Amino acid sequence: PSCLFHSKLQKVLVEDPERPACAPAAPRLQMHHVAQVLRELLGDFTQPLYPRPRHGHVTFTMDPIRDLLIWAIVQNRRELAGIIWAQSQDCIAAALACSKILKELSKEEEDTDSSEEMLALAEEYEHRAIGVFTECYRKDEERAQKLLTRVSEAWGKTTCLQLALEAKDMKFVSHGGIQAFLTKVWWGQLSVDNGLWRVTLCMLAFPLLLTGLISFREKRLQDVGTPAARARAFFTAPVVVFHLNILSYFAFLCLFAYVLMVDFQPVPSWCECAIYLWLFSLVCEEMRQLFYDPDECGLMKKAALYFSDFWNKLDVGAILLFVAGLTCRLIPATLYPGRVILSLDFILFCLRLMHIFTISKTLGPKIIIVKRMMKDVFFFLFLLAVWVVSFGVAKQAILIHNERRVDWLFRGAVYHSYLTIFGFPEWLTVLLLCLYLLFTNILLLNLLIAMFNYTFQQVQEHTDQIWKFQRHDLIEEYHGRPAAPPPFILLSHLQLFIKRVVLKRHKQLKNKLEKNEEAALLSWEIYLKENYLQNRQFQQKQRPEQKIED
Amino acid sequence: TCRLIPATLYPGRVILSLDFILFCLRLMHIFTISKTLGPKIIIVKRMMKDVFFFLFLLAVWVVSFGVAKQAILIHNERRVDWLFRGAVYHSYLTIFGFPEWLTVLLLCLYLLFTNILLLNLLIAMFNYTFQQVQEHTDQ
């Protein structure tokens, strides 16, 4: 009862409302209760582990050992769970599940000693999962590739990699083989090695792909040339879809700029409706991004997660600004404001071009850096603002008499304040100018020196792993995104809408495998586990404190 | 050969002017033989690599702000050499560093994103590309 999990279980069980009739007041403890607190600790995406009965000799579950490991891990029993993990079923999912549960618990720990050990144990389990995975990958590559995409029926019908992404398993995803898997699924059907410029070259030319100017793995396509199927597999690769999408985006913004510049006119031209319908197709694709999830999570949680997306938040802000400016252009009396409102719309699109350099080798880290630095840029902006308006109202008050000029005094005062801030009257003039060079030209720049040296030096190392971690989700999106450009995404949109009107993830990310194949796979990894363990304890014997004890 | 063309005497001459610039950078080749300065040549040779890809992003930011500034405070005119040159001059004057509310909004955005952020990006990037190499360069 000293642990945090007992208090959380008691707070659930006391708030359990559906137990009306019994001899006592405190009804019972059922397994669906601890399943319910486990689901809220673990995340929304999994199913409930234990089912609720809709109502023998010995009732036996799918596996006892997982629940035993859960019982051991919620109470921070270290050496016990270290023992019983050796008899696991599929240890790679198991150590991930325990590290995620430990990380989700240790943040809410509210104790200055339990949180630290709770974190360190999760780090050790990360190391265990890494160590078994680097063994089984080194045994055979392509078979171990199948291990990640496999759904585990044990852990509530999920696969391990989305669980690791949920756990922020930063040391785990940074392994070479998993990144190679990501690169393999990123480069689509063809071979991986073509570089970047040759992709653009075959992007420019249609019949080059039918000729002998490009690579293919899966040599049936490389030897037997079916150029319809070859072009189909070529367009199926998400690099191609990404490049055509960014090209269509570039053409869309350029034509939007030209039509906004010279073709503004009160009657509707054809071009304004053209860019309007381009944006309309774009926001239908963005709505499709909201309405996909076959994992039946919270629709409120789905909209919160998509609203938690920074780029999606900027996108819907630009949509709201566009639909404000469109009805201001609809008013014939507000033509000059509404037009320049759309000008801001162009700015709210070009910031989307900062979305590119995540795919760069090096620049993505700097995007992470400026995303960090914005957080105190904001609350420094507030203080510089109140300082400069204090100096401005002082400058307005000193060298004039009291006049009620609403547009004469305020505008000239704001112009003088901006001229100051863009960087016998002799004694008072020297005092004003020396104060101006004193507080403005020195202090707050040094505040930014200290604050930004701090917010740089606090993070100037591990960001490469953060970029490697952040690599996944865009590949996830573009595998999910269809292959048509936003001028032609409507053909897919109508087909998907009528398909869901009259009536599923891809198999390359999640698949119910064959059971006898899965048993062979499980026996293989469970054979490799003991091979890991022997050398593990052998090298752990070689620490000098152990030899001192011996 | 531009000086060879008698009709292109003013461009070709100033082309050779750039030639003089392309020779004086060769004088940076000297201070490798210095005791101490050669390391700093190595340092700037390191720093050019992200100077380039920062230059791209500052360029697209300033041209976005420039086309915004062109679009806001004028009517639609087809001036090819009148509007574009004055717009580029106003953008360079900005980047070298009841209209009251809109003027305060434009000037506060100008002091907001330009006068703060990208300099701090260079602070972080160049503190990083300095501190990653600030030791073994003598060897």
Numbering used by the authors:
A (entry chain B): 528 to 582, 613 to 980, 1020 to 1099, 1104 to 1150
B (entry chain A): 884 to 980, 1020 to 1061
What's written in the study?
Intracellular ADPR targets and activates the nonselective, calcium-permeable TRPM2 channel in the presence of Ca2+. Belonging to the transient receptor potential melastatin family (TRPM), TRPM2 shares a characteristic MHR1-4 domain, a transmembrane domain (TMD), and a coiled-coil domain with the other family members. It is unique due to owning a characteristic C-terminal NUDT9-H domain, which has been considered a classic binding site for ADPR and its derivatives, but the presence of the ADPR binding site has not been directly observed. In summary, our human TRPM2 structures defined two distinctive ADPR binding sites, one in the MHR1/2 domain and one in the NUDT9-H domain.
